[PDB]
Amino acid sequence: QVQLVEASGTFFRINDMGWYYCKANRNWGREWDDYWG
Amino acid sequence: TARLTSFIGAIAIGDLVKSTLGPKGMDKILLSSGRDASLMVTNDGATILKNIGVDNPAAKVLVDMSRVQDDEVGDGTTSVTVLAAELLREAESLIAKKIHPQTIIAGWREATKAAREALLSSAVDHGSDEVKFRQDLMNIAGTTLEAERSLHDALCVLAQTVKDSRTVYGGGCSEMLMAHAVTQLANRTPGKEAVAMESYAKALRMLPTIIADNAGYDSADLVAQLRAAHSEGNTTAGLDMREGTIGDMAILGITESFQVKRQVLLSAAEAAEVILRVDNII
């Protein structure tokens, strides 16, 4: 789905980018989309 | 596509029912049959609609909406046909100036809202004090009068008046007042909906113009005098159809039942809209 390097994949958008691990909310985030490092 | 086939039929059904509008309205003679050759002369405006053969399909939406105003109200059958046809005659102009029929409708909706909100504030509920109520009913019965036919019409109007005791003046006071309030609104709306509300107002001022064009008076002058009287605070002026001037419609005893006038406005605007949002006739 989403490969993240510390981002790429089947994404049309990047809503928020944070550091936890690097977190990126890819699509409209309904808690279904959640990608970390 | 029918931007004319569905508009000239409407303005024709409301172009032959006019000239019978005011008190001194012309007549029409109904050559009906070919063998039982019958001549009946009609100063009425509803008989010329329940009798003629409607050929155009858009015209049906007016001829079958006048029955509503006639069998569910009584008086106000030639004013919701003529108002609808002079709304659909200014529509034709706006749609020829490349304005979309879906902005004219959105404009006329706010226009009829500001108009219904305008003759409501000017209604007088004299039904409380029954010494004037007796008087008012006589004015509303005189502004409504084959004999028993007209009498039944007057009875329906009077019944609606006793139910809703609010009364608004007639002869041009109500139409000119609503047109003034619609122009006062169209002077404050930014967008193409202002050319539609000004057009709505120009259509409302066509009822007194036709009431004067039927008594020989100088309508282009009396209607301007009304528009000025109704634009400098005075709100009770109106055609004095006894000497061809403008008179106080309160001291002259020319009143109409608020329900009849509001339903005339509503049915006219609704029919004009229903015939507006029609491209093709299948």
Binding site: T10, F12, R13, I14, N27, W28, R30 | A2, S6, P57, A58, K60, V61, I99, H100, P101, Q102, T103, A106, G191, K192, E193, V274, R277, V278, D279, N280, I281, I282
Partner: protein, 249 residues
Amino acid sequence: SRLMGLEALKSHIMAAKAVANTMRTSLGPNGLDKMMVDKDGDVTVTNDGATILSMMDVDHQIAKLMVELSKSQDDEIGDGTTGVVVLAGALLEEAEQLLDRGIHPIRIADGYEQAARVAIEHLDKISDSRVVYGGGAAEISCALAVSQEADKCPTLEQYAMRAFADALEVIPMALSENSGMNPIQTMTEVRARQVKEMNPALGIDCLHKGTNDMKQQHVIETLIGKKQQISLATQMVRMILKIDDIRKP
């Protein structure tokens, strides 16, 4: 055999462009009605299908083919049957200018097939419930997708991939029309916004509510109710774009 060949696909398209141009003025909520008038009837309806399509248009046996194929959309996949006649009309109207260049109809059909594969391959990226957001916004997120992939095709299909992009933007151009808005200006001013800020939910506000963001206006389209429009229209073009003759004894 009278009028057969590449001059029979300018008549077949003039025929399937009439049943579409009538249905082009009824898409949006601000869809202008039509009057049903036959030997007996005065119905005023703006909906689709039997209410509009299959009570008229007996001509060229091809309008009868559009109305024959649109029965598959309604009764069967919700009620999205005006968007498939307008989309088919747009695809054929672009094929009209693709044929003048000298592209064999089969080639245009393969191009539309590739472009529909790309579009349906892009709609399923925007399932957000099962659901693709947008009144006029789903057809601008795909037109942007099949325009990029167009230049990755080295054959003549590339022209058809671009004509499919240019025709997918007709749904959010009869939505701009049928209202008091300018079609090109409004369609573009929201197409340039799905790029330069990634939000495929931005679409035409047929209702003048004010926000060009169909995510919050809550105007939605079921996904299989859009995977059909993009498909049933292409499967309708590829049946009207490939028949070469109408013989009538």
